[PDB]
Design a protein around this motif. Structure first.
Motif, short mmCIF file in Angstrom:
data_model
loop_
_atom_site.label_atom_id
_atom_site.label_comp_id
_atom_site.label_asym_id
_atom_site.label_seq_id
_atom_site.Cartn_x
_atom_site.Cartn_y
_atom_site.Cartn_z
N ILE A 276 0.71 -0.99 -0.04
CA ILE A 276 0.05 -0.04 0.07
C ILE A 276 0.85 1.14 -0.15
O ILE A 276 1.71 1.46 0.95
CB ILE A 276 -0.91 0.08 1.19
CG1 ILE A 276 -1.62 1.09 1.14
CG2 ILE A 276 0.00 -0.02 2.50
CD1 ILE A 276 -2.54 1.11 2.29
N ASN A 277 0.91 2.04 -0.99
CA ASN A 277 1.60 3.08 -1.21
C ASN A 277 1.31 4.45 -0.44
O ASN A 277 0.68 5.06 -0.72
CB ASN A 277 1.76 3.53 -2.86
CG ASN A 277 1.79 2.38 -3.88
OD1 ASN A 277 2.85 1.44 -3.65
ND2 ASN A 277 0.95 2.44 -4.63
N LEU A 278 2.36 4.46 0.83
CA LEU A 278 1.86 5.37 1.54
C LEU A 278 2.33 6.78 1.19
O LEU A 278 1.56 7.94 1.49
CB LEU A 278 2.79 5.32 2.93
CG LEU A 278 2.27 3.97 3.73
CD1 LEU A 278 2.97 3.55 4.78
CD2 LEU A 278 0.97 3.96 3.92
N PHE A 279 2.96 7.04 0.08
CA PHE A 279 3.41 8.42 -0.32
C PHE A 279 3.14 8.74 -1.63
O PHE A 279 2.59 9.72 -2.29
CB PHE A 279 4.89 8.76 -0.10
CG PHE A 279 5.32 8.55 1.40
CD1 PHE A 279 5.09 9.99 1.90
CD2 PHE A 279 5.98 7.69 1.92
CE1 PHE A 279 5.27 9.88 3.36
CE2 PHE A 279 6.39 7.69 3.32
CZ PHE A 279 5.91 8.68 4.17
N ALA A 280 3.32 7.33 -2.74
CA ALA A 280 2.93 7.75 -4.00
C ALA A 280 1.44 7.80 -4.33
O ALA A 280 0.63 6.87 -3.81
CB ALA A 280 3.49 6.42 -4.86
N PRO A 281 0.87 8.69 -5.12
CA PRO A 281 -0.37 8.61 -5.46
C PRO A 281 -0.66 7.87 -6.31
O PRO A 281 -0.13 7.41 -7.25
CB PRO A 281 -0.52 10.26 -6.18
CG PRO A 281 0.53 10.86 -5.68
CD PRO A 281 1.79 9.93 -5.49
N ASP A 282 -2.12 7.10 -5.92
CA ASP A 282 -2.29 5.93 -6.87
C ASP A 282 -3.42 6.48 -7.96
O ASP A 282 -4.16 7.65 -7.54
CB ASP A 282 -3.04 4.74 -6.05
CG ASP A 282 -1.92 4.13 -5.33
OD1 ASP A 282 -0.76 3.67 -5.71
OD2 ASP A 282 -1.89 3.97 -3.87
N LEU B 269 8.72 1.74 -3.59
CA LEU B 269 9.37 1.20 -2.27
C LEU B 269 8.54 1.50 -1.02
O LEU B 269 8.46 0.61 0.02
CB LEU B 269 11.01 1.87 -2.13
CG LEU B 269 11.47 1.30 -0.82
CD1 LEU B 269 11.57 -0.23 -0.58
CD2 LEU B 269 13.12 2.06 -1.07
N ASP B 270 7.89 2.74 -0.90
CA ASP B 270 6.70 3.29 0.30
C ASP B 270 5.74 1.84 0.49
O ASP B 270 5.45 1.89 1.61
CB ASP B 270 6.26 4.31 0.09
CG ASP B 270 5.58 4.58 -1.30
OD1 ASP B 270 6.39 4.27 -2.24
OD2 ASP B 270 4.29 5.18 -1.40
N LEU C 106 6.39 -0.73 3.60
CA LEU C 106 6.44 -0.53 4.74
C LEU C 106 5.32 -1.05 5.91
O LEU C 106 5.68 -1.58 6.83
CB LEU C 106 6.21 1.09 5.05
CG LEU C 106 7.38 1.60 4.27
CD1 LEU C 106 6.96 3.19 4.37
CD2 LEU C 106 8.75 1.19 4.82
#
Ligand code: FGZ
Ligand code: FGZ
Lengths: 284, 284, 284, 284
Positions: free
Chosen positions: B138-144, B240-241, B244
């Motif tokens: 789940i991408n905590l920083f990259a907008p999906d 990579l985010d 986590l």
């Protein structure tokens, strides 16, 4: 392979004579590797790397150096930024031993010394393996000082056995590793007046005008060698968020994180750490 | 060891007969390991794991399974949440082959299938190795949606060679890996009507009421085996985010990150990936 | 309050004569604030801050400065590191206008200029408001170049209207803000030979030997003023992970993040941004 | 506006009679807001929100509710997962007071209750303001238990005044806020046998089979209202890394971070917090 059989000394010049203690092993081997220990009270090369030196010496010519201020190396009462100071000492020992370019393995404080060395003498350092290193770490989420640094400072202020034990307990995930024998041994080494001299020298060094040389996370984008960062997921001294700037800015970096492991990766995960190191440094 | 010599088929029951294609190698070996490929257009086991299967088969009995919707496995026009669907298919193939508890290696989509499998049939899956996996990320920083997903969606909408090449180029750090031969081969497999059937089936599956079964980052705290997460620092599909939450909540997790590597770790860092996998799965 | 009524010019010295265009408003107001605009092609002070200048001018003496290369300021064909170049021009305008210590509000590229100015002339800058700033941001998880940066690059190579529209579309969360009129207006400004000269000038400026001056995340620990960082969660140019180093190392930092907002915070959340800015700068 | 004047009681049903204490103010105001306090030992609604209630009551109809186990609400010796327990009591008070959809402001443990309520009774909760909330936070980089949590635990085992003071000291950035009077006042309340019963009750509640209800970071993607997360950068209880999952998965989220602020946002930055809250909740 014991403390006594591997023990050596050398005299280098860093603002005058400086005695470095060190351990030498695997002398018949081709690739030379320098180990730099972490910086707790009573810390030294042998106790830091005891589960690793024998194994690494089957493949490498190992040099585990007691840093100035630690072990049986000189405990001056005054020095500048510690990582630069120690890196100068290592520069001296390299030239004396005729070493050319050599890979560095350093945990915690020694990692900072490895990094400080690799930035100051680029042609002298090869691949770096760095376990929860100081210096290049900057904790993006953990408020500073971290729990582990707080407990270390508390011991520096009031050097009791109880304070020393509290500090050692936030070093590891498995607290059973903190035995009465280990605390007694660390405490004996740490409460000698020379060690207390070394602790004041370290404390005074923080007020130095050269503090910027310790903020190596501003500089590591310049490292050209591959760098293996190794971290314990539960590290309470240099937490995992401290790895991000180095992982991002060091071009050929790698990061390995172990779960159920604290600050002392080379102890709590000695086996996995040994293989990763051997493999990363080229198998010997 | 070629596509043809290793090729096998099996029929399992997932709401009816389902044909699974797969490759079998290292049959004399003791430890059984299942490889699950990533989910690009034209993706299959052999092209995904070509730099890895020969090496792994010296130590392991390797089973690289084409997932339903891919390779020469059945391309149904309708299915539910894909990872659950594929995991059911793998459950069928396991029982047929008499496999008990077996470690899973999956990248991207297949990683999600490995994870979905390990949660649905806990006694059937051992250690997991997961390269840039979907599902638990789940991408905590990259907008999906991320750049890579956007480019994949664009190909699903307008399946041209130009769009396919653009997508393959954000898969890797070294763009030279994207050769005219590779694009032509991927495109030929991907533009057949059956593959286009499979793409619509996948798209319709997203509107499903069982979408929650794909959000495996909510569930992975339940995994009891060691899990090795492997990631490319420059991954533009699953950044990579996204690692986590899994690294934090999976009790016995490990994370390895390679710099100068994109989404296809098993290709761009085939060697390092092979050793890490072999070592993590117990050497054979 | 219009373009023409607020238009002013001044001539400063940065390696020769340099004409700066800027807008002045709320002259009756007690406190002076300098706005520094974001840096798309065809961008200028008035366009960037349109939903903002009128509201800000009720409380402050506003100076919205066209950065060199933009709007009606001089568009040289060659220059060094852009933020230091732009800060030098700003330093010149400050001395010209007899400004003391003034707060700076910078969006994107302007944010980098505002910061670079505060580091180079510590005594001249007070509080900073910075929306998705370049320079002090370093993307710890997003691979560089980011999707937004790539689109800008595509435009510099092939400045078509399709390319400009595509770039503006990754600037915002709600794409309806990108009207054909807006694209047409930007494309008119951006396709002039003078504007394209300035755009190539910027690109060549990256190959500079003064690149270190652009890596401000190494230096902002020296900032003593309060700094408000404002970020949109779906920013695809300078993603949210870029805020961490500044947020951590700037002692009196604060961060505000808007969900459902992209790179253009001051437009998409103009109201919340205006109130946040006014209050942070002391009500005026 | 005093304790006694605003005091009210109500009796609701959660597996039997339960007495809830709460404070009511700004009764003439149009909009109702429920405040849910943080959860240290000796904590209650009035103490938590003292620098806040008067200011909030000029705009809103304020209901500051003592959560079960705290202040003058019933302190049972046994209960299930605390946030669901506390949300059930809140649900009861809502029906009693004929409330529709009401915004919730929750600090810390209260934040978890506010969130748990919004998930369990979707139609009853509007906008949320959450200061360093427990529950939806998950510490991705900080090892658990955190330093703040450890101190609380030390107090539950050995409830001395030294232990309480030490706990309150990791609650704040500026330690001068921890006055002997404040310690003495908290210790008086916290050392009553009724308060210590409630504290053990909380601890035993963690061994519960309903633990999953406390892991709200798995569920907040379902929240449809705007949510304002407020966090102090130096929070040592629920560190800043705990905000990432909520910030990412709550569609209409916003985050504000204060530097030089700890766990007690509403006290240490009372002014900025009040203004941020009032504006976010619609000016009232
Ligand atoms: O400020 C911007 O919009 C901006 C500035 C630069 Cl230098 C850039 O490369 C991009 Cl993508 C945007
Ligand atoms: O809200 C708090 O202050 C709080 C609540 C709990 Cl449950 C806790 O464990 C701690 Cl350290 C603080």
């Amino acid at each position: 392979l014991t403390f006594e059989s591997t023990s050596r000394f050398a005299e280098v010049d860093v603002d005058g004579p400086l005695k470095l203690h060190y351990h030498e092993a695997g002398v018949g081997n081709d690739q030379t590797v320098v180990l730099l220990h972490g910086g707790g009270p009573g810390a030294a090369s042998w106790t830091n790397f005891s589960r690793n030196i024998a194994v690494l010496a089957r493949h490498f010519h190992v040099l585990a150096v007691d840093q100035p201020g630690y072990g049986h190396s000189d405990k001056r009462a005054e020095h500048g930024q510690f990582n630069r100071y120690a890196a100068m000492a290592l520069k001296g020992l390299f030239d004396q031993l005729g070493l050319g370019r050599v890979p560095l393995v350093g945990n915690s404080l020694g990692g900072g010394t490895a990094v400080r060395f690799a930035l100051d003498y680029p042609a002298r350092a090869g691949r770096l393996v760095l376990m929860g290193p100081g210096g290049l770490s900057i904790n993006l989420f953990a408020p500073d000082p971290t729990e582990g640094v707080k407990r270390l400072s508390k011991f520096s202020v009031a050097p009791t056995r109880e304070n020393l034990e509290a500090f050692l307990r936030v070093m590891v995930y498995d607290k059973n590793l903190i035995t009465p024998e280990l605390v007694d041994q660390r405490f004996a080494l740490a409460s000698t007046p020379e060690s207390l001299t070394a602790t004041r020298a370290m404390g005074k060094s923080f007020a130095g005008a050269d503090f910027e040389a310790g903020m190596m996370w501003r500089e590591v984008y310049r490292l050209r060698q591959p760098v293996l960062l190794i971290w314990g997921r539960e590290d309470r001294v240099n937490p995992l968020d401290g790895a991000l700037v180095a992982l991002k800015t060091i071009p050929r970096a790698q990061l390995h994180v172990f779960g159920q492991c604290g600050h002392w990766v080379q102890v709590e995960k000695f086996d996995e750490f040994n293989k990763l190191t051997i493999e990363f440094l080229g198998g010997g």
